[PDB]
Amino acid sequence: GTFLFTSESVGEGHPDKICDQISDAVLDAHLQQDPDAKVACETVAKTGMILLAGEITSRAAVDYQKVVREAVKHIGYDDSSKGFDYKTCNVLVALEQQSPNEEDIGAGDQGLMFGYATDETEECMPLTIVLAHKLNAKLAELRRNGTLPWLRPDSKTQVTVQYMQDRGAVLPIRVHTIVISVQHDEEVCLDEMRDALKEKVIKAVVPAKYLDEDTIYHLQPSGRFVIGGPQGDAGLTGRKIIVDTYGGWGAHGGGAFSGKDYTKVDRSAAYAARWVAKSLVKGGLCRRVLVQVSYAIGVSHPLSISIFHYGTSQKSERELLEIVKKNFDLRPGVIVRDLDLKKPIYQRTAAYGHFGRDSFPWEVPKKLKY
Amino acid sequence: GTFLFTSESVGEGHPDKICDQISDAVLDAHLQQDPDAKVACETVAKTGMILLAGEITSRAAVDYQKVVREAVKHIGYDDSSKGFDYKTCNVLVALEQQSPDIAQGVHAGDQGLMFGYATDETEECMPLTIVLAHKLNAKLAELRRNGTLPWLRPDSKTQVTVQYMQDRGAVLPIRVHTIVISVQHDEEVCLDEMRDALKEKVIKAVVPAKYLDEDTIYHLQPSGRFVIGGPQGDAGLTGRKIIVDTYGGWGAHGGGAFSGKDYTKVDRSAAYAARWVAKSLVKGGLCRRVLVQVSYAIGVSHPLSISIFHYGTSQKSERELLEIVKKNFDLRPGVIVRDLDLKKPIYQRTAAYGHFGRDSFPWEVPKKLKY
Amino acid sequence: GTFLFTSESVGEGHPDKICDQISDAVLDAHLQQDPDAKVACETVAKTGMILLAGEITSRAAVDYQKVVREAVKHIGYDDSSKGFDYKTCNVLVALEQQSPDIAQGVHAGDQGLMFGYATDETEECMPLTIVLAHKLNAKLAELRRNGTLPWLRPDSKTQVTVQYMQDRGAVLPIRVHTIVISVQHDEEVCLDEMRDALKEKVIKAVVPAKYLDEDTIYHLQPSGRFVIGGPQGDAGLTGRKIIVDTYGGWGAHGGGAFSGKDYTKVDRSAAYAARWVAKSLVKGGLCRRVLVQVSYAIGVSHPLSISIFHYGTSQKSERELLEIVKKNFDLRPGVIVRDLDLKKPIYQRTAAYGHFGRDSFPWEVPKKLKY
Amino acid sequence: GTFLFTSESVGEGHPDKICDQISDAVLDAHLQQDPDAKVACETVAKTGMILLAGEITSRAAVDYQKVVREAVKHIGYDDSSKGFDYKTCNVLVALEQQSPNEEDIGAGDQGLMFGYATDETEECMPLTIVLAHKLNAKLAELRRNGTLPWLRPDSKTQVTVQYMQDRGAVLPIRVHTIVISVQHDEEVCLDEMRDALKEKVIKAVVPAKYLDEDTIYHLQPSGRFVIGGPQGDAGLTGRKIIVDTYGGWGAHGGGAFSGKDYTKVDRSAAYAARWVAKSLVKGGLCRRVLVQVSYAIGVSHPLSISIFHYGTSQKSERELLEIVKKNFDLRPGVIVRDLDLKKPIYQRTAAYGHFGRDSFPWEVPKKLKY
């Protein structure tokens, strides 16, 4: 049977994503000096304020004012006309910082985590969330290179796709609806914005085979959007966890990723579960798969591993599990080495999705032996 | 045929849940005085600080000192020895409140989806993994408050792994495979005594005996020592336990936290409606297990689309169930608000022990279906 | 015989004065609704932040978003280019407000001293050094607001050194020795043009020509460049300009700031009373220059002691002046409050340009004395 | 003619003095690593919170959480029963920190400053403020060594003395009134507290010749005082400037001292003016004297220097000025060298008065040539 599915993505200037990106900029600053830094950094953004709160164990000396302001400048908030300015906003810091066989390190917390993959795209991700992210990334590219200099940092996209099912797999047929709202400078009209959104953004990102006569476009649906970001709005780290992962597809364990080092299995085991799911699909063992893992605080080994193939394998779920246990060691002290999780690359994961890119180690499938 | 599935839950004193409870206490304070209040309240808790941020349109005048402090008191943080004290903590108010529109005084949102889920494996009509996880935290609070284990403090986390088998799409719990409990405690009690009380007075008082066996794995105080807890040990924020609030990893989640958001946030009121629909189908005997997917389109009050996925557990087709749902439910967000009585101040009770599964809310009372 | 004496003053946009003005705006908001409000409001201003802290007992419901933002708007900080903007700054409210006593609803402090001072060297009855310093800041604000020098920003500081001679204890200003002016400015204007306008349109519009000569020293924009100012460049707090608020180093100060404190704080209302007494003696022709010292004892409403020090500028003994003061003034703090109308919301006007010397307040209106 | 004079002092646990002491602990932490650090650190204390705000130019890496908490522990707040606890209070940091002939350095700000001295005590200070400070210091000594273990950190004293005048000098005759309020543990009665205040504090500090039959004692005048410090109270740096100096005597320029390095003439020139006043009095050039100096931002030399002797010299005020100008160079870049103002000794100045101690360089008179 057929169904519609909708995923959302948000640009770097959305207040929740500002916080994710600042959190990871703080993490990256620690890791550049101290690869073994432990970081749990939560960020809050509201009118005129960034606040940092959390715990850090690190030998680094980090200038938080500079790291935060620079990230805000990088996002593109440099003037009160845009709603926020890195030069004059309030930065408050409440980070409590202590000084300090690695394969046996215990999980930093308990929790459950999922990975997912699907053969419907080359990236091995759901089409809805690939397209939603790609529309926001293209907005930011065109903003930053001056192709559309009226663009500002805050944006939200929603993409509805009509699917068919094929023996537990999902086959995207057409884009049903695209919604784009993007922040903009006072000096452009809506007719021009709408035309640019359709021609320079949607047509540059969405394969033409999914767009047809009945595709519904809602471009700047709420009209003008001059002020954005944290102004009259409050955001927090870890409030876009569905957007950061599979856009509604598969499942989620509840843990946020941004501002967390590798011992926080919320992030490292979700990355490893994605790596497992992608490896199974690119291995041709199934067409779509969900992987669950779980941990207890202070315990190095997973408490559970489970594999659900949606009926898209010739192997049983039990046989896939046995294969997974022969090819992967999901201790955090081992995941760190296989996925290089002490490298300061996290600020790049904080927008446009943690999954479906090529450059990240969890997106390179492992050759399986079975 | 068998598989494992794990869910977690956290106690009232976990720092993220403190924040959910405070944000909903704020919402209830506003609704008490102004049933049309619009609220989007975020809370941050860290060593000695409660910060309230967000936007409110309301006629209410709320005393945040009182609302925040009583909530913290009720949770049980009343001394520096416990890491946090309602008498001495810093309450910072950064909320932006405006009066409702002058001219309306004198006279349906995002393109998005919501999921509801229900399963006949428990009477709560919820996954056993998460029902048990919630009940373990609730039992710790009960024994802490009636003084049976006076060494307990408010911060707790639990995790339950169940071994299941499948039967024509339904899931049948066989036994509890693994239980984790970590709970904050006073300085005097010993690990042995804690691990013994958690097994004998908590777990065995909550988990049906038929699910426990000699191979069940217990990880009780697995870190070894948990004196530092609450916001002292970890920063809390509103809306960071969204899976604990819902189905424990089962079903699906389309995104959005609930607490500190009024009934006009559709990702809060339509999620409750989709639960209501899923629970009504299962209690109506129409299927054993169901995922209800409700899509809304920018503007249109009527849902864009509804899909019902019964996993094979129904004698009727997915198109027949969809027809039943349409004949019995009106899922326009304004109709939902009236049918589920969502203008009333009951939200603080939702903010610990899960939004779904308790027999305390209108969305947990099934609708008798005609067909 | 001659000597130098220096005093300073600061503009409305100096970060410490922003805080004094906000704290008094808070007090006035409360008094407007509840004339018995008790207020002790502290303000901190730093890059992008206004923080309100302190204690209030009041029946008022005040909108701090509005009160703080309008005050900042009025000061002139309305864009990030100026370093601070009322539209986008973070207002954090940490004030602790309680209702007045339940049971009194249905039905004189520290051992300390206060000083008043007055001198006949100006009509304001204040030292010339500080009268001139205040007027230079006021003139900058006037020319900034009417657009004569649109390159001016709100943050300014001035300092005036006067050469004096003495005559039987009175002080006689001879000339202005040195003037300092530092004022925040836009990016485009050049130092030469600023230094020329400050001399020609500010100083020469304010200082009587008889005090200026070819040897007068001008330090105008002495740091060279002052684009970064307001709370961006320096943290402000309430009650850090207490000498600018009073006599500019002349007379004496027994300790205490004024702004954000209601009339029941005796170090605020008895300082105004002692000014009133000192000014009344000088305008009554009883002396040319006077320091009035009023001591209060823990509990006793009546002053413990009053000493009058006339520096030799009076035909009457210091004991005769004391007798006159006692026959004409009742310095019990409750009587002071009634006589000077201190329950009214006029405090925000006190918080820039000095509490003493302007003909705008009851304590600056002399009492006609009988003797 | 005779008159009464009253001075106040407050203990380390008074909320305003907590902030002064934290500000100077932050300054001292910078100076221990970077002698040329520029610091303007303001502290705010209220229920459950210390906030730091200001500007720093320094090469130091300072852990602010540790510096603040430790200072709070040092003051003696370790439990919510006392109203405040270093282990669980909120510490928020908003310090903006940049990296960077010294005799020519310009004043860090404009301002006026006074120094004062008087021959009425050996310390060359007014008796009222010497006694007020000494009562608070003795309370803290007895608290910290366990002589009176019921004592807590917050305290306030007021001392009224009856004076005579002698040719512009002031002669203290008797103590008229002593007020002491001190914070205390629940477990002591007021009768015992009052007796200890009189016998172990007042009699150990006030010379017996000033105490007589009519001396009024107000000991714990407002009754019980269990909770103190910042709880239901707000304090700020630089709100006790009269207490920190001459207790009402002489004059004040308005600048606070705590949290400021030597380029902030509010502090360095006030120290130097005190040094000048003390040198004149110990030199026998007068019995009592007030010194004024003033500065402009970015200008190294004083704009004005003035000397008022109260009629207590045989020399004219003009002759004293000429002597001062021959023996002292009041440029901040020179004052720093003469008074050793890069040394991290400032936390010790933050309670019990900056003046009248023996160990500080501004309290050692210079031998004058004239």
Å from B83 to nearest chain D CA? Answer: 6
How many alpha carbons fall within 13 Å on the CB side of residue A308? Answer: 19
B160 contacts in A (CB within 8 Å)?
none
B93 sits in which H/E element:
strand B90-93
Report how far residue A80's alpha carbon sits from residue C215's, in angstroms, rounded to the nearest whole number: 46
C-alpha distance from residue B23 to each of B18, B44, B71, B157, D89 (Å): 9, 10, 10, 20, 22
Q: Say which residues have a Cβ less than 8 Å from residue D151's Cβ, sequence separation at least 6.
A: D139, D142, D143, D182, D183, D184, D185
Please say whether the dihedral angle defined by the alpha carbons of residues D329, D332, D337 and D341, taken in this order, is positive or negative.
positive
Report how far residue A5's alpha carbon sits from residue D15's, in angstroms, rounded to the nearest whole number: 58
Q: Which residue of A has its CA nearest to B254?
A: A248
Backbone angles phi, psi at A111, to 5 degrees: 160, 175
With an 8 Å Cβ cutoff, are B49 and D87 in contact? no
- Enumerate chain D positions whose Cβ falls within 8 A of a Cβ in B: 46-49, 79-80, 83-85, 87-92, 231
CA D350 distance to own-chain centroid:
6
Query: Is D99 annotated among the ligand-binding residues?
Result: no
- Enumerate chain C positions whose Cβ falls within 8 A of a Cβ in B: 61, 63, 65, 90-94, 96-97
Mutate to test the interface with B, among A9, A220, A236 (most CBs of B within 10 A): A236
Mutate to test the interface with A, among D62, D63, D70, D90 (most CBs of A within 10 A): D63
C197 sits in which H/E element:
helix C191-197
With an 8 Å Cβ cutoff, are B79 and D83 in contact? no
Instruction: For residues D280 and D252, state if they share a domain.
Output: no
Per-residue DSSP letter, B177: E
Question: Which are the residues after which chain D is interrupted (C to N > 2.5 Å)?
Answer: 100
> Do B229 and B153 meet the contact criterion of CB atoms below 8 Å apart?
yes
Report how far residue D149's alpha carbon sits from residue A156's, in angstroms, rounded to the nearest whole number: 62
Report how far residue A21's alpha carbon sits from residue A16's, in angstroms, rounded to the nearest whole number: 9
With an 8 Å Cβ cutoff, are C94 and B94 in contact? no
> Do B12 and B177 meet the contact criterion of CB atoms below 8 Å apart?
no
Cβ atoms within 10 Å of C187's Cβ, excluding its own: 8
Q: Which of C48, C80, C87 sits opposite A49 (nearest CB)?
A: C48
B55 has catalytic annotation: yes
Q: Which of D111, D177, D232 sits opposite C297 (nearest CB)?
A: D177
Q: Which of C61, C63, C92 sits opposite B94 (nearest CB)?
A: C92
C55 contacts in D (CB within 8 Å)?
232-234
**β-sheet bridge partners, residue A33:** none
C-alpha distance from residue C180 to each of C132, C211, C357 (Å): 11, 15, 21
With an 8 Å Cβ cutoff, are D97 and A61 in contact? no
Q: How many domains would you assign to chain C?
A: 3
Instruction: For residues C206 and C272, state if they share a domain.
Output: no
C30 has catalytic annotation: no
Q: Kindly name the residue from D46, D174, D194, D239 that is annotated as catalytic.
A: D239
Report how far residue C355's alpha carbon sits from residue C272's, in angstroms, rounded to the nearest whole number: 8
Backbone angles phi, psi at A255, to 5 degrees: -80, 140
With an 8 Å Cβ cutoff, are B159 and A303 in contact? yes
How many alpha carbons fall within 13 Å on the CB side of residue A2? Answer: 9
Cβ atoms within 10 Å of D3's Cβ, excluding its own: 18
> Do A21 and A352 meet the contact criterion of CB atoms below 8 Å apart?
no
Mutate to test the interface with D, among A33, A55, A96, A99 (most CBs of D within 10 A): A96
Nearest to C255 by CA among B259, D132, B208: D132
Query: Is A223 annotated among the ligand-binding residues?
Result: yes
Q: Are strands C289-296 and C305-309 parallel, antiparallel or unpaired?
A: antiparallel
Instruction: For residues C186 and C210, state if they share a domain.
Output: yes
Please report, to the nearest 10 degrees, the dihedral formed by the alpha carbons of residues D325, D329, D330, D333 taken in order.
170
**β-sheet bridge partners, residue D297:** D107
Report how far residue C348's alpha carbon sits from residue C268's, in angstroms, rounded to the nearest whole number: 14
Report how far residue C155's alpha carbon sits from residue D120's, in angstroms, rounded to the nearest whole number: 43
C272: three-class secondary structure by DSSP: helix
Instruction: For residues A286 and A245, state if they share a domain.
Output: no
Domain boundary among C208, C243, C265: C265
Instruction: For residues B18 and B77, state if they share a domain.
Output: yes
B203: three-class secondary structure by DSSP: helix
Question: Which are the residues after which chain C is interrupted (C to N > 2.5 Å)?
Answer: 107
> Do D125 and D9 meet the contact criterion of CB atoms below 8 Å apart?
no
- Paired tokens of A317: 């779920």
With an 8 Å Cβ cutoff, are C48 and A48 in contact? yes
Please list the alpha-helical segments (H only) found in chain B. 15-33, 64-75, 102-105, 128-145, 191-197, 204-206, 266-283, 318-328, 333-339, 347-350
- Paired tokens of B142: 């009960």
Instruction: For residues B76 and B65, state if they share a domain.
Output: yes
With an 8 Å Cβ cutoff, are B223 and A47 in contact? no
Nearest to C185 by CA among C208, C152, C156: C152
B118 sits in which H/E element:
strand B112-119
Please list the alpha-helical segments (H only) found in chain A. 15-33, 64-75, 127-144, 190-196, 203-205, 265-282, 317-327, 332-338
- Paired tokens of B273: 């409606």
B16 has catalytic annotation: yes
D119 has catalytic annotation: no
With an 8 Å Cβ cutoff, are B91 and C94 in contact? yes
Report how far residue C248's alpha carbon sits from residue C111's, in angstroms, rounded to the nearest whole number: 25
Buried b (16+ CB within 10 A) or exposed e, A287-319: bbbbbbbbbbbbbbebbbbbbbbbebbebebee
Q: Kindly name the residue from B30, B135, B153, B241 that is annotated as catalytic.
A: B241
Report how far residue D332's alpha carbon sits from residue D267's, in angstroms, rounded to the nearest whole number: 10
How many alpha carbons fall within 13 Å on the CB side of residue D14? Answer: 25
Å from C5 to nearest chain D CA? Answer: 7
> Do A82 and D85 meet the contact criterion of CB atoms below 8 Å apart?
no
Q: Which residue has the tokens 């990355």?
A: A271
> Do B40 and B256 meet the contact criterion of CB atoms below 8 Å apart?
no
C-alpha distance from residue A326 to each of A323, A329, A330, A369, B211 (Å): 5, 8, 11, 8, 30
| Amino acid at the residue C152 | L
Domain boundary among C178, C211, C228: C228
Å from B90 to nearest chain D CA? Answer: 5
Instruction: For residues A188 and A319, state if they share a domain.
Output: no
Å from C317 to nearest chain D CA? Answer: 10
- Enumerate chain A positions whose Cβ falls within 8 A of a Cβ in C: 46-49, 79-80, 83-85, 87-92, 231
Nearest to D118 by CA among D9, D247, D8, D206: D247
Instruction: For residues B180 and B191, state if they share a domain.
Output: yes
CA C169 distance to own-chain centroid:
26
> Do D97 and A65 meet the contact criterion of CB atoms below 8 Å apart?
yes
B167 sits in which H/E element:
strand B152-167
With an 8 Å Cβ cutoff, are A256 and B240 in contact? yes
Å from C304 to nearest chain B CA? Answer: 38
Helices B64-75/B15-33 angle, 10° precision = 140
- Paired tokens of A252: 């989620």
Q: Which of B61, B63, B93 sits opposite C93 (nearest CB)?
A: B93
Q: Kindly name the residue from B234, B320, B330, B339 that is annotated as catalytic.
A: B234
| Amino acid at the residue C60 | A
Residue B160: which CATH number? 3.30.300.10
Report how far residue C213's alpha carbon sits from residue C199's, in angstroms, rounded to the nearest whole number: 12
Domain boundary among B201, B228, B255: B228
Helices D15-33/D64-75 angle, 10° precision = 130
C6 contacts in D (CB within 8 Å)?
112, 292, 294, 303-304
Instruction: For residues B74 and B116, state if they share a domain.
Output: no
Per-residue DSSP letter, B80: G
**Domain range enclosing D269:** 106-126+265-369
The 3-state secondary structure of chain D reads CCEEEEEEEECCCCHHHHHHHHHHHHHHHHHHHCCCCEEEEEEEEECCEEEEEEEEECCCCCCHHHHHHHHHHHHCCEEHHHCEECCCCEEEEEEEEECCCHHHCCECCCEEEEEEEECCCCCCCCHHHHHHHHHHHHHHHHHHCCCCCCEEEEEEEEEEEEEEEECCEEEEEEEEEEEEEEEECCCCCHHHHHHHHHHHHHHHHCCHHHCCCCCEEEECCCCCCCCCCCCCCCEECCCCCCCCCCCCCCCCCCCCCCCECCCCHHHHHHHHHHHHHHHHHHCCCCCEEEEEEEECECCCCCCEEEEECCCCCCCCHHHHHHHHHHHCCCCHHHHHHHCCCCCCCHHHCCCCCCCCCCCCHHHCCCCCCC
Experimentally, the structure was elucidated by X-ray
As annotated, the active-site residues of A are 14, 16-17, 42, 55, 156, 225, 233-234, 239-240, 260, 264, 266
Instruction: For residues A17 and A31, state if they share a domain.
Output: yes
Instruction: For residues D201 and D330, state if they share a domain.
Output: no
Nearest to A23 by CA among A360, A268, A256, A357: A256
Per-residue DSSP letter, A172: E
Instruction: For residues D219 and D346, state if they share a domain.
Output: no
